[PDB]
Amino acid sequence: KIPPRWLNCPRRGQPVAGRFLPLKTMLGPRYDSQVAEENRFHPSMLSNYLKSLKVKMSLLVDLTNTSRFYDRNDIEKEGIKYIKLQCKGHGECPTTENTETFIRLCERFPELIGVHCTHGFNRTGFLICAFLVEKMDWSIEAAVATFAQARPPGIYKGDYLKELFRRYGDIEEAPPPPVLPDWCFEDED
Ligand SMILES: [Mg+2]
């Protein structure tokens, strides 16, 4: 079954720090019977969009911990490096080891780096913000606020925002999660 709350979720955010492109997961043709034409997001749609702008993606980081959504060969056949980066499960935010893995990988790679989880907000924003602070010397306040504007409403799990502030700023200054837009729950019933 297609993931819940995916049909209404924007396919991509604006690029962050001129380097990262936040995305929801693509869904290959295997799901076309569950997804109307106007809502599809096959891997070909992403590479065709980049080609239309004469932009290359150097690497696509998949944070979903699954191979059921789409075929990684649809990305690699276009010359984009593909990495499946396993993140801590059980709803927990990425560990320090996961953030180090992410940083080690992205620092080797102008071209964009695509980053996606299932929906493109929490694991995706967490790792992008961690990279911006540890490698690009941004403040965590700036990283979180920029991700929220680029991919609204940004990270929305309160524990993720608190853990970023614990690692990189003052935990007492962590913002509460944003109020969510009405599209988030259109499919609940
Ligand atoms: Mg195919």
Coordinates of all heavy atoms in Angstrom, one line a residue, residues 10-26 41 43 45-47 49-51 53 55-63 75 80 102 106 111-117 119-121 124-125 128 132 147 150-151:
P10 N 3.9 17.8 -1.1 CA 4.7 18.3 -2.2 C 5.8 17.4 -2.5 O 6.5 16.9 -1.6 CB 5.1 19.7 -1.8 CG 4.2 20.1 -0.7 CD 3.9 18.8 0.0
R11 N 6.1 17.2 -3.8 CA 7.2 16.3 -4.2 C 8.6 16.8 -3.7 O 9.4 16.0 -3.4 CB 7.2 16.1 -5.7 CG 6.0 15.4 -6.3 CD 6.0 15.6 -7.8 NE 4.9 14.9 -8.4 CZ 3.6 15.5 -8.5 NH1 3.4 16.7 -8.0 NH2 2.7 14.8 -9.1
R12 N 8.8 18.2 -3.8 CA 10.1 18.7 -3.4 C 10.1 20.0 -2.7 O 9.1 20.7 -2.8 CB 11.0 18.9 -4.7 CG 10.5 19.9 -5.6 CD 11.3 19.9 -6.9 NE 10.4 20.4 -8.0 CZ 10.2 21.7 -8.2 NH1 10.9 22.6 -7.6 NH2 9.3 22.0 -9.1
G13 N 11.1 20.3 -1.9 CA 11.2 21.6 -1.2 C 12.2 22.5 -2.1 O 12.6 22.0 -3.1
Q14 N 12.4 23.7 -1.7 CA 13.4 24.5 -2.3 C 14.8 24.0 -1.9 O 14.9 23.4 -0.8 CB 13.3 26.0 -1.8 CG 11.9 26.5 -2.2 CD 11.9 28.0 -2.2 OE1 12.9 28.7 -2.3 NE2 10.7 28.5 -1.9
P15 N 15.8 24.2 -2.6 CA 17.2 23.8 -2.2 C 17.6 24.5 -1.0 O 17.2 25.7 -0.7 CB 18.1 24.0 -3.4 CG 17.3 24.9 -4.3 CD 15.8 24.8 -4.0
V16 N 18.3 23.8 -0.1 CA 18.8 24.4 1.1 C 20.3 24.6 1.1 O 21.0 23.7 0.7 CB 18.4 23.4 2.3 CG1 19.1 23.8 3.6 CG2 16.9 23.4 2.4
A17 N 20.7 25.8 1.5 CA 22.1 26.2 1.4 C 22.8 26.0 0.1 O 24.0 25.8 0.0 CB 22.8 25.4 2.6
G18 N 22.1 26.1 -1.0 CA 22.5 25.9 -2.4 C 23.0 24.5 -2.7 O 23.7 24.3 -3.7
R19 N 22.7 23.5 -1.9 CA 23.3 22.2 -2.0 C 22.3 21.0 -1.8 O 22.5 20.0 -2.6 CB 24.4 22.0 -0.9 CG 25.2 20.7 -0.9 CD 26.6 21.0 -0.4 NE 27.5 19.9 -0.5 CZ 28.7 19.8 0.1 NH1 29.2 20.8 0.8 NH2 29.4 18.8 -0.1
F20 N 21.4 21.1 -0.9 CA 20.5 19.9 -0.7 C 19.1 20.2 -1.2 O 18.5 21.2 -1.0 CB 20.4 19.7 0.8 CG 21.7 19.3 1.5 CD1 22.4 20.3 2.1 CD2 22.2 18.0 1.4 CE1 23.7 19.9 2.7 CE2 23.4 17.7 1.9 CZ 24.2 18.6 2.6
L21 N 18.6 19.1 -1.9 CA 17.2 19.2 -2.4 C 16.3 18.2 -1.6 O 16.4 17.0 -1.8 CB 17.2 18.8 -3.8 CG 15.8 18.9 -4.5 CD1 15.3 20.4 -4.6 CD2 15.8 18.3 -5.9
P22 N 15.5 18.7 -0.7 CA 14.6 17.8 0.1 C 13.5 17.3 -0.7 O 12.8 18.1 -1.5 CB 14.1 18.7 1.3 CG 14.5 20.1 0.9 CD 15.3 20.1 -0.4
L23 N 13.2 16.0 -0.6 CA 12.2 15.4 -1.4 C 11.4 14.4 -0.5 O 11.9 13.9 0.5 CB 12.8 14.4 -2.5 CG 13.8 15.1 -3.4 CD1 14.6 14.1 -4.2 CD2 13.0 15.9 -4.4
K24 N 10.1 14.1 -0.9 CA 9.4 12.9 -0.4 C 9.9 11.7 -1.2 O 10.5 11.9 -2.3 CB 7.9 13.0 -0.4 CG 7.2 13.0 -1.8 CD 5.7 13.3 -1.8 CE 5.2 13.2 -3.2 NZ 3.7 13.3 -3.1
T25 N 9.6 10.5 -0.8 CA 10.0 9.4 -1.6 C 9.3 9.3 -2.9 O 8.1 9.7 -3.1 CB 9.9 8.0 -0.9 OG1 10.4 7.0 -1.7 CG2 8.4 7.7 -0.7
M26 N 10.1 8.9 -4.0 CA 9.5 8.6 -5.2 C 8.7 7.3 -5.1 O 9.0 6.5 -4.1 CB 10.6 8.5 -6.3 CG 11.1 9.8 -6.8 SD 12.9 9.9 -7.1 CE 13.4 9.6 -5.4
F41 N 4.9 10.3 -8.9 CA 6.2 10.9 -8.7 C 7.2 9.7 -9.0 O 7.8 9.2 -8.0 CB 6.4 11.5 -7.3 CG 7.7 12.2 -7.0 CD1 8.4 12.7 -8.1 CD2 8.2 12.2 -5.8 CE1 9.6 13.4 -7.8 CE2 9.4 12.9 -5.5 CZ 10.1 13.5 -6.5
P43 N 10.7 8.1 -10.3 CA 12.1 8.6 -10.4 C 12.3 9.3 -11.7 O 13.0 10.4 -11.6 CB 13.0 7.3 -10.3 CG 12.1 6.4 -9.5 CD 10.7 6.6 -10.0
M45 N 10.5 11.4 -13.2 CA 10.0 12.8 -13.1 C 11.0 13.7 -12.5 O 11.3 14.8 -12.9 CB 8.7 12.8 -12.3 CG 8.2 14.3 -12.1 SD 6.6 14.2 -11.2 CE 5.5 13.8 -12.5
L46 N 11.7 13.1 -11.5 CA 12.8 13.9 -10.8 C 14.0 14.1 -11.8 O 14.4 15.3 -12.0 CB 13.3 13.2 -9.6 CG 14.6 13.8 -9.0 CD1 14.3 15.2 -8.5 CD2 15.1 12.9 -7.9
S47 N 14.4 13.1 -12.5 CA 15.5 13.3 -13.4 C 15.1 14.1 -14.6 O 16.0 15.0 -15.1 CB 16.2 12.0 -13.8 OG 15.3 11.1 -14.2
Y49 N 13.0 16.6 -14.6 CA 12.9 18.0 -14.1 C 14.3 18.6 -14.0 O 14.5 19.7 -14.6 CB 12.2 18.1 -12.7 CG 12.2 19.5 -12.2 CD1 11.4 20.4 -12.9 CD2 12.9 19.8 -11.1 CE1 11.4 21.7 -12.4 CE2 12.8 21.1 -10.6 CZ 12.1 22.1 -11.3 OH 12.0 23.4 -10.8
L50 N 15.2 17.9 -13.4 CA 16.6 18.4 -13.4 C 17.2 18.6 -14.8 O 17.8 19.7 -15.0 CB 17.5 17.4 -12.6 CG 17.0 17.3 -11.1 CD1 17.9 16.3 -10.4 CD2 17.0 18.6 -10.4
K51 N 17.0 17.6 -15.7 CA 17.5 17.8 -17.0 C 16.9 19.1 -17.7 O 17.6 19.8 -18.4 CB 17.1 16.6 -17.9 CG 18.0 15.4 -17.6 CD 17.5 14.2 -18.4 CE 18.2 12.9 -17.9 NZ 17.9 11.8 -18.8
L53 N 16.3 21.9 -16.4 CA 17.0 23.0 -15.9 C 18.5 23.0 -16.1 O 19.2 23.9 -15.6 CB 16.6 23.1 -14.4 CG 15.1 23.4 -14.1 CD1 15.0 23.7 -12.6 CD2 14.6 24.6 -14.8
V55 N 20.6 20.9 -14.7 CA 21.1 20.7 -13.4 C 21.4 19.3 -13.2 O 20.6 18.4 -13.7 CB 20.1 21.2 -12.3 CG1 20.4 20.6 -10.9 CG2 20.0 22.7 -12.4
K56 N 22.5 19.0 -12.5 CA 22.8 17.6 -12.2 C 22.7 17.3 -10.7 O 23.0 18.2 -9.9 CB 24.2 17.2 -12.7 CG 24.4 17.2 -14.2 CD 25.9 17.0 -14.5 CE 26.2 17.5 -15.9 NZ 27.6 18.1 -15.9
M57 N 22.2 16.1 -10.4 CA 22.2 15.7 -9.0 C 23.4 14.8 -8.8 O 23.5 13.8 -9.6 CB 20.9 14.9 -8.7 CG 20.9 14.3 -7.3 SD 19.2 13.9 -6.7 CE 18.5 15.5 -6.6
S58 N 24.3 15.1 -7.9 CA 25.5 14.2 -7.7 C 25.2 12.9 -7.0 O 25.7 11.9 -7.3 CB 26.6 14.9 -6.9 OG 26.1 15.3 -5.7
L59 N 24.3 13.0 -6.0 CA 24.0 11.9 -5.1 C 22.5 12.0 -4.6 O 22.1 13.1 -4.4 CB 25.0 12.1 -4.0 CG 24.7 11.4 -2.6 CD1 24.9 9.9 -2.8 CD2 25.6 11.9 -1.5
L60 N 21.9 10.9 -4.4 CA 20.6 10.8 -3.8 C 20.7 10.0 -2.6 O 21.1 8.8 -2.7 CB 19.6 10.2 -4.8 CG 18.1 10.0 -4.2 CD1 17.5 11.4 -3.9 CD2 17.2 9.2 -5.1
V61 N 20.4 10.5 -1.4 CA 20.4 9.8 -0.1 C 19.0 9.4 0.3 O 18.2 10.3 0.5 CB 21.1 10.7 1.0 CG1 21.3 9.9 2.2 CG2 22.4 11.2 0.5
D62 N 18.8 8.1 0.3 CA 17.5 7.5 0.7 C 17.6 7.1 2.2 O 18.3 6.1 2.5 CB 17.2 6.3 -0.2 CG 16.0 5.5 0.0 OD1 15.3 5.7 1.0 OD2 15.7 4.7 -0.9
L63 N 16.7 7.7 3.0 CA 16.6 7.5 4.4 C 15.4 6.7 4.8 O 15.1 6.7 6.0 CB 16.5 8.9 5.1 CG 17.6 9.9 4.7 CD1 17.3 11.3 5.4 CD2 19.0 9.4 5.2
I75 N 17.6 5.7 -10.8 CA 18.4 6.8 -10.4 C 19.8 6.6 -10.9 O 20.4 7.5 -11.6 CB 18.4 7.0 -8.9 CG1 17.0 7.3 -8.4 CG2 19.4 8.0 -8.4 CD1 16.4 8.6 -8.9
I80 N 23.4 9.3 -11.4 CA 23.3 9.9 -10.0 C 23.7 8.7 -9.1 O 23.2 7.6 -9.2 CB 21.9 10.2 -9.8 CG1 21.4 11.3 -10.7 CG2 21.7 10.7 -8.3 CD1 19.8 11.4 -10.7
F102 N 26.1 10.3 7.4 CA 25.6 11.2 6.5 C 26.6 12.3 6.1 O 26.8 12.6 4.9 CB 24.3 11.9 7.0 CG 23.7 12.9 6.1 CD1 22.8 12.4 5.1 CD2 23.8 14.2 6.2 CE1 22.2 13.3 4.2 CE2 23.2 15.1 5.3 CZ 22.4 14.7 4.3
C106 N 28.2 13.0 2.4 CA 27.9 14.2 1.6 C 29.2 15.1 1.5 O 29.3 15.7 0.4 CB 26.8 15.0 2.3 SG 25.2 14.1 2.2
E111 N 26.4 20.9 -8.2 CA 25.4 19.8 -8.4 C 24.7 19.7 -7.0 O 25.2 20.0 -6.0 CB 26.1 18.5 -8.7 CG 27.1 18.5 -9.8 CD 27.5 17.2 -10.4 OE1 27.2 16.1 -9.7 OE2 28.1 17.1 -11.5
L112 N 23.4 19.3 -7.1 CA 22.7 19.1 -5.9 C 22.8 17.7 -5.2 O 23.1 16.7 -5.9 CB 21.2 19.2 -6.2 CG 20.8 20.7 -6.7 CD1 19.4 20.6 -7.3 CD2 21.0 21.7 -5.6
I113 N 22.5 17.6 -3.9 CA 22.4 16.3 -3.3 C 20.9 16.2 -2.9 O 20.4 17.0 -2.1 CB 23.3 16.2 -2.0 CG1 24.7 16.3 -2.4 CG2 23.0 15.0 -1.2 CD1 25.7 16.5 -1.2
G114 N 20.2 15.2 -3.4 CA 18.8 14.9 -3.1 C 18.8 14.2 -1.8 O 19.7 13.3 -1.5
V115 N 17.9 14.4 -0.9 CA 17.7 13.7 0.4 C 16.2 13.4 0.6 O 15.5 14.4 0.5 CB 18.2 14.6 1.6 CG1 18.2 13.7 2.9 CG2 19.7 15.1 1.4
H116 N 15.9 12.2 0.8 CA 14.5 11.9 1.1 C 14.3 10.8 2.2 O 15.1 9.9 2.3 CB 13.7 11.4 -0.2 CG 13.9 10.0 -0.6 ND1 13.2 9.0 -0.1 CD2 14.7 9.5 -1.6 CE1 13.5 7.8 -0.7 NE2 14.5 8.1 -1.6
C117 N 13.2 11.0 2.9 CA 12.7 9.9 3.8 C 11.4 9.5 3.2 O 11.2 9.7 2.0 CB 12.6 10.4 5.3 SG 12.0 12.0 5.6
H119 N 8.4 11.0 3.8 CA 7.6 12.3 3.5 C 8.5 13.5 3.2 O 8.1 14.5 2.7 CB 6.6 12.6 4.6 CG 5.7 11.5 4.9 ND1 5.9 10.5 5.8 CD2 4.4 11.3 4.4 CE1 4.9 9.7 5.8 NE2 4.0 10.1 5.0
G120 N 9.8 13.4 3.6 CA 10.7 14.5 3.3 C 10.8 15.6 4.3 O 11.1 16.7 4.0
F121 N 10.4 15.3 5.6 CA 10.5 16.4 6.6 C 11.3 16.1 7.8 O 12.3 16.9 8.0 CB 9.1 16.8 7.1 CG 8.1 17.3 6.1 CD1 7.4 16.4 5.3 CD2 8.1 18.7 5.8 CE1 6.6 16.9 4.2 CE2 7.2 19.1 4.8 CZ 6.5 18.2 4.0
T124 N 14.9 13.8 7.0 CA 15.5 14.6 6.0 C 15.9 16.0 6.5 O 17.1 16.4 6.4 CB 14.4 14.9 4.8 OG1 14.3 13.6 4.1 CG2 15.0 15.9 3.8
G125 N 15.1 16.7 7.2 CA 15.5 18.0 7.8 C 16.5 17.8 8.9 O 17.4 18.6 9.0
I128 N 20.0 17.2 7.2 CA 20.4 18.4 6.5 C 20.9 19.5 7.5 O 21.9 20.1 7.4 CB 19.3 19.0 5.6 CG1 19.2 18.0 4.4 CG2 19.6 20.4 5.1 CD1 17.9 18.3 3.6
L132 N 24.6 21.3 8.0 CA 24.8 22.7 7.9 C 25.5 23.2 9.1 O 26.4 24.1 9.0 CB 23.5 23.5 7.8 CG 22.5 23.3 6.6 CD1 21.4 24.3 6.6 CD2 23.2 23.2 5.2
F147 N 15.2 25.4 6.8 CA 14.5 24.2 6.4 C 13.0 24.4 6.5 O 12.3 24.0 5.5 CB 15.0 23.0 7.2 CG 14.4 21.7 6.7 CD1 14.9 21.1 5.5 CD2 13.3 21.1 7.3 CE1 14.4 20.0 4.9 CE2 12.8 20.0 6.7 CZ 13.3 19.4 5.6
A150 N 12.1 26.4 3.4 CA 12.3 25.7 2.1 C 11.3 24.6 1.9 O 11.0 24.2 0.8 CB 13.7 25.1 2.2
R151 N 10.9 23.9 3.0 CA 10.1 22.7 2.9 C 9.0 22.7 4.0 O 9.0 22.0 5.0 CB 11.1 21.5 3.2 CG 10.6 20.1 3.2 CD 10.0 19.7 1.9 NE 9.5 18.3 1.9 CZ 8.7 17.9 0.9 NH1 8.3 18.7 0.0 NH2 8.3 16.6 0.8

